[PDB]
Ligand binder design. Sequence first.
Ligand SMILES: CCOc1cc(/C=C2/C(=O)Oc3cc(O)ccc32)ccc1OC
Ligand SMILES: CCOc1cc(/C=C2\C(=O)Oc3cc(O)ccc32)ccc1OC
Ligand SMILES: [Mg+2]
Ligand SMILES: [Mg+2]
Ligand SMILES: [Zn+2]
Ligand SMILES: [Zn+2]
Lengths: 324, 324
Amino acid sequence: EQEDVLAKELEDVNKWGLHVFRIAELSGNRPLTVIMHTIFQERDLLKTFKIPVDTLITYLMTLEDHYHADVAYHNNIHAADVVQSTHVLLSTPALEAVFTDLEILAAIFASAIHDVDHPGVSNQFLINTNSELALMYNDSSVLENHHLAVGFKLLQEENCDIFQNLTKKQRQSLRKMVIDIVLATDMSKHMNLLADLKTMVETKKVTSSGVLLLDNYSDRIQVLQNMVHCADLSNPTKPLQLYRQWTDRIMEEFFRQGDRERERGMEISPMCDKHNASVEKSQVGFIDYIVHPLWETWADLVHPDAQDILDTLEDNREWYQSTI
Amino acid sequence: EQEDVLAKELEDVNKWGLHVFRIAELSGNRPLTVIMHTIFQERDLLKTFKIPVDTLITYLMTLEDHYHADVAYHNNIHAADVVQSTHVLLSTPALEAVFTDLEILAAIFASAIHDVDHPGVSNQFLINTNSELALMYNDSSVLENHHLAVGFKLLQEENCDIFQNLTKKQRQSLRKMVIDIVLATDMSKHMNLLADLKTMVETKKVTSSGVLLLDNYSDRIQVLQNMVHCADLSNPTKPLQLYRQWTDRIMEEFFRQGDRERERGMEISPMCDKHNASVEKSQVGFIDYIVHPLWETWADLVHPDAQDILDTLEDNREWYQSTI
Ligand SMILES: CCOc1cc(/C=C2/C(=O)Oc3cc(O)ccc32)ccc1OC
Ligand SMILES: CCOc1cc(/C=C2\C(=O)Oc3cc(O)ccc32)ccc1OC
Ligand SMILES: [Mg+2]
Ligand SMILES: [Mg+2]
Ligand SMILES: [Zn+2]
Ligand SMILES: [Zn+2]
């Protein structure tokens, strides 16, 4: 029974290193729909926010349909992966729960739409090719603004408004939080985001029970920004067999961008030249300069709830280094 | 001939208080085209940037077409007025030889497109009514992002690329400057923009020729941002018979938005209720809390160049107050 094996894999929905590619395979290329549906049922969110299950499934299906099947990395599997990853980091003891049912709905919904309709090329490529997207969004977080616009737009399709029974004030607060979160997935925001995460760790305050003490929205949205950002950058922290599949996919997507750049005689973007790549050195550099500094700071913030995640990252870094 | 009178009126293009409304009538409702053309000729700009005169006229007419002839204030007359005001502010003695031809071109071009395709309603209205515009731009500088997208997009129409002979670095630099400037016209940026301008005035450096010293992009763009912002908020600084017609038009536009709001059961925005608005009191508050703090700070930046403009503003403030 297909549906039995799928049901069994989804029993790991609360675990880092959730088996996501087989869930993709077993669900008929519907990992975003089935993982979101599971997390919503797991979190009682359909009953809390009076979401008709058919409206939930209708939207998730349409949303998943607007992820490109022919994009190697930024597709529905990556969205499902970021959703489930955010789902875990929300339930860390040092934060669980400290985010209301609305900001939890925000981080999850934002994770689900955060790359929707991704064309498989970078903001810089879109800027350099005088794309309609870069023309629309004035070269600023072009992809991320588009992801938001599509993710919200699809709510207006027939029987897709999963927020229909939220109050108008809940809809507004949720909308702002989702926008704030998704716009923060733009990698050009990473350094300022991490600096602000570091500042917060230095002035950190917690319960004796352990729960982190955040008072104002400015700090709570910033933890949710860095959380989804961490989930977006969580591939090198997953078990190696998952990590290596993500590396294959992102390198395939980079390489095809470099193919489009070479056809047009454009400068080939970093890591995008399949005739001049070092996949392994790139992963080590990626970990050393982006992923580990971010996850070391996040681990401090939720100390010690992220130790196993951080441990896996450092094991994977050591392994990739050893392939050089 | 009607063109003899138009040409005579266009001899005032370097003067504060040019009668832009007469020029609007005398030009067959083409104040933006004729004023931009006059200014480009006055500043040597078609020669400096190899702009074909037919390309300039064609783009200007297409750009002017995309201002709404049905909107009382945010129409082509306002665009021409802001162009011409920015043109005058660029020529202030404290700024001679400061800005490059490309920066001057960026500021004037930004002024020309800065409100194109304005629907006559506020950002908050577009947000609150779930407009397609607010959906596209995620509730952030909705109008101002749209003005930019339309203004740049129209350069791609037939024989409309007035920048066709700029170098690649010139267009890239101009595009970024235009974006930075138009985004700064969003009133939600005003307080931070003004706070930055205050700081610049307090720490101001001049050259040995008494001219403002602008060391870097951040300071140069911020002066151009506030300059165009001042031109955008320059109505109360104009001779009273010009100011008063601007007040008639903005109140008309506000009231027509308030009608749309009062229909939908929405809370009518401040100053949009024709059955409960004080035109005179709103002008005094507008000057006291927005326009005068801005123009007094701009006057300090270029002191004493702008004393007559500041004097007129204070006289007009006096006059509106006297009618209460
Ligand atoms: C070596 C890169 O590896 C990955 C990058 C990414 C993503 C990136 C992206 O979208 O934009 C970047 C810009 C950068 O400077 C660095 C990384 C990224 C994901 C998985 C990877 O490996 C599994
Ligand atoms: C009492 C207000 O009077 C005026 C306002 C305005 C302008 C603006 C306004 O009310 O909101 C804005 C938001 C923006 O982003 C840019 C400009 C404006 C112009 C003339 C007036 O009177 C002659
Ligand atoms: Mg993304
Ligand atoms: Mg405007
Ligand atoms: Zn992503
Ligand atoms: Zn304006």
